[PDB]
Amino acid sequence: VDFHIPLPGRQSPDHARAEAEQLAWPRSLGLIRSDAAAERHLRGGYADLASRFYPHATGADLDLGVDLMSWFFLFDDLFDGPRGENPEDTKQLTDQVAAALDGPLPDTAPPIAHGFADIWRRTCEGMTPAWCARSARHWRNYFDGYVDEAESRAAQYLAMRRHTIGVQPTVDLAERAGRFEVPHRVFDSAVMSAMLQIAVDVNLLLLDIASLEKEEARGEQNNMVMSRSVSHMQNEVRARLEQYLLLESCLPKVGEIYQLDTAEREALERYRTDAVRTVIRGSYDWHRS
């Protein structure tokens, strides 16, 4: 599926290691129990993914992203059954996990939940408060959507799987890992927001053509396709990136506009290249077909 993402692909020089100790965390958290589930997990190349979403994270930082990614797919597995077919139900879990953004949870709490909590802890630990509060809301929306999606008892779809995809939490993570924050003043910008929306959509599209042969065979008929549709999807991605660049260029000017500091300007730059860009190129540098 030849696309048009005029952006350099990166991988964190540490992944070497990372991908090797990747099981450690989840096994201890109870997310992986049988030697089979560990294998299953390895075949997913989640550490390999995180390493592409966070080229700038080396070791202790990279590891976290590996987990977030790692946790992402495990968590999803929990809704592949009939639970993903009844909103009331999914939310029963949703809140147990999401409760971690409020404070410690009773041991009684499932592992998938204790798992998320440990990620959060380390993720939000060391960032400004205003940030965690934001980075959290985002998570909140992620969770919210899994329910709204479970409301299954064209563009209408995006709004739906716009929060479910979980792209933002990932992007957020780039900052978590990169030990830096985009000047909050700009992350709210009409431009940056526009840039982010794209990152999402692009991912939300690439994914749909890869997990197609699977979703086409089974039920789930919400996938963006349901050979021509493929085209205006390959096309849509083109224009999406094509514009991404246009936006990217207005960035410096956006700097003036928000009287951006002598060093906030550098911070934002990190965001463009290490958070928003990667999250796009990386998704692509993963698939096959």
Backbone angles phi, psi at 148, to 5 degrees: -50, -25
Question: What is the rounded CA–CA span in Å between residue 151 and residue 263?
Answer: 45
Inter-residue contact 4 to 237 (CB < 8 Å)? yes
Question: What is the rounded CA–CA span in Å between residue 165 and residue 224?
Answer: 13
Place of tokens 């919210």: 144
Q: Give me the sign of the Cα torsion angle 264, 270, 273, 276.
A: negative
Could you tell me how many helices (H) and strands (E) the chain has, helices first?
16, 0
| Domain count of the fold of the chain | 1
Indicate which technique resolved this structure.
Answer: X-ray
Residue count of the chain, please give it: 289
Inter-residue contact 91 to 147 (CB < 8 Å)? yes
Burial 136-174 (b: 16+ CB within 10 A, else e): bebbebbbbbbbbbbeeeeeeebebbbbbbbbbbbbbbb
Residue 75 class from Cβ within 10 Å (0-12 exposed, 13-18 middle, 19+ buried)? Answer: buried
SS (H, E, C) 104-144: CCCCCCCHHHHHHHHHHHHHHCCCCHHHHHHHHHHHHHHHH
How many other C-beta atoms are found inside a 10 Å radius of the C-beta of residue 277?
A: 22
Inter-residue contact 48 to 15 (CB < 8 Å)? yes
Question: What is the rounded CA–CA span in Å between residue 47 and residue 67?
Answer: 8
Question: What is the rounded CA–CA span in Å between residue 236 and residue 233?
Answer: 5
Inter-residue contact 5 to 280 (CB < 8 Å)? yes
Residue 107 class from Cβ within 10 Å (0-12 exposed, 13-18 middle, 19+ buried)? Answer: exposed
Place of tokens 């909103």: 87
Question: What is the rounded CA–CA span in Å between residue 227 and residue 261?
Answer: 49
Question: What is the rounded CA–CA span in Å between residue 182 and residue 130?
Answer: 12
Inter-residue contact 97 to 112 (CB < 8 Å)? yes
Could you tell me the CA-to-CA distances from 81 to 55, 68, 85, 93, 97 in Å, in that order? 34, 22, 7, 13, 18
Question: What is the rounded CA–CA span in Å between residue 200 and residue 53?
Answer: 13
Question: What is the rounded CA–CA span in Å between residue 54 and residue 16?
Answer: 14
Q: What is the resolution of this structure in A?
A: 3.5
**Token pair listed for 37:** 């589930």
Amino acid type, 278: T
Question: What is the rounded CA–CA span in Å between residue 51 and residue 285?
Answer: 11
Question: What is the rounded CA–CA span in Å between residue 66 and residue 41?
Answer: 12
Question: What is the rounded CA–CA span in Å between residue 139 and residue 259?
Answer: 30
Spatial CA neighbour of 18 closest among 59, 76, 54 = 59
First to last CA, the chain: 7
Inter-residue contact 62 to 15 (CB < 8 Å)? yes
User: What one-character DSSP code corresponds to residue 81?
Assistant: S
**Token pair listed for 260:** 């951006």
Tell me the residue range of the domain where 251 lies: 1-289
Inter-residue contact 282 to 65 (CB < 8 Å)? no
Spatial CA neighbour of 71 closest among 107, 128, 28, 15 = 28
DSSP conformation letters of 159-220: HHTTTTT-HHHHHHHHHHHHT----HHHHTSHHHHHHHHHHHHHHHHHHHHHSHHHHHHSS-
| CATH code: domain of residue 284 | 1.10.600.10
Could you tell me the CA-to-CA distances from 204 to 155, 159, 192, 217, 261 in Å, in that order? 12, 11, 18, 19, 34
Residue 181 class from Cβ within 10 Å (0-12 exposed, 13-18 middle, 19+ buried)? Answer: buried
Question: What is the rounded CA–CA span in Å between residue 50 and residue 62?
Answer: 7
Inter-residue contact 17 to 59 (CB < 8 Å)? yes
SS (H, E, C) 53-68: HCCCCCCHHHHHHHHH
Backbone angles phi, psi at 59, to 5 degrees: 80, -130
Question: What is the rounded CA–CA span in Å between residue 94 and residue 112?
Answer: 10
